[PDB]
């Protein structure tokens with residue numbers, strides 16, 4: 001457990017809808033550096049289920065193209081923590097959200113020597129929210145991040161932030 005900030009009292013139904021990946025950071029440069037980097041993902045929409053799982057729509061650059069992806073993050077016993085099903089079991093943690101403006105989340109690999117970690121600042125609108133970005137930078141201050149990206153409003157309105 002690298003990340004030690006989770007949202008108390010998270011109501012997952014209230015994160016439904018449209019989001020923008022305004023800023024991203026990761027523990028290793030290689031996780032975000034190229035357009036095709038493994039955790040360079042651009043959130044489109046969050047769809048919580050009635051049983052409280054979380055369907056994620058996002059874009060990712062794969063094979064010289066911007067591809068649509070649909071991911072399912074299954075709930076755990078902790079409201080703020082979800083598990084993505086993949087070869088390596090990947091936890092999604094919601095750090096902080098106000099539902100109406102911003103949501104901060106991190107994804108971490110369960111076990112790895114110096115396990116990898118990416119975090120995003122999501123916002124509801126294609127605007128630079130300095131307040132959400134300050135909350136994101138404060139949340140990351142002790143995490144061992146080595147790359148950070150952020151996107152301008154023009155980019156946020158383009159597929160894969162071109």
Ligand SMILES: CCCCCCCCCCCCCCC(=O)O
Pocket residue numbers: 015038039041043046056060069071084092094103105107
């Ligand atoms: C509550 C906020 C949840 C947003 C979580 C987004 C998780 C994104 C995980 C994507 C991991 C890469 C998938 C693409 C691939 O399999 O190549």
Ligand SMILES: [Cl-]
Pocket residue numbers: 075076077078
């Ligand atoms: Cl659990």
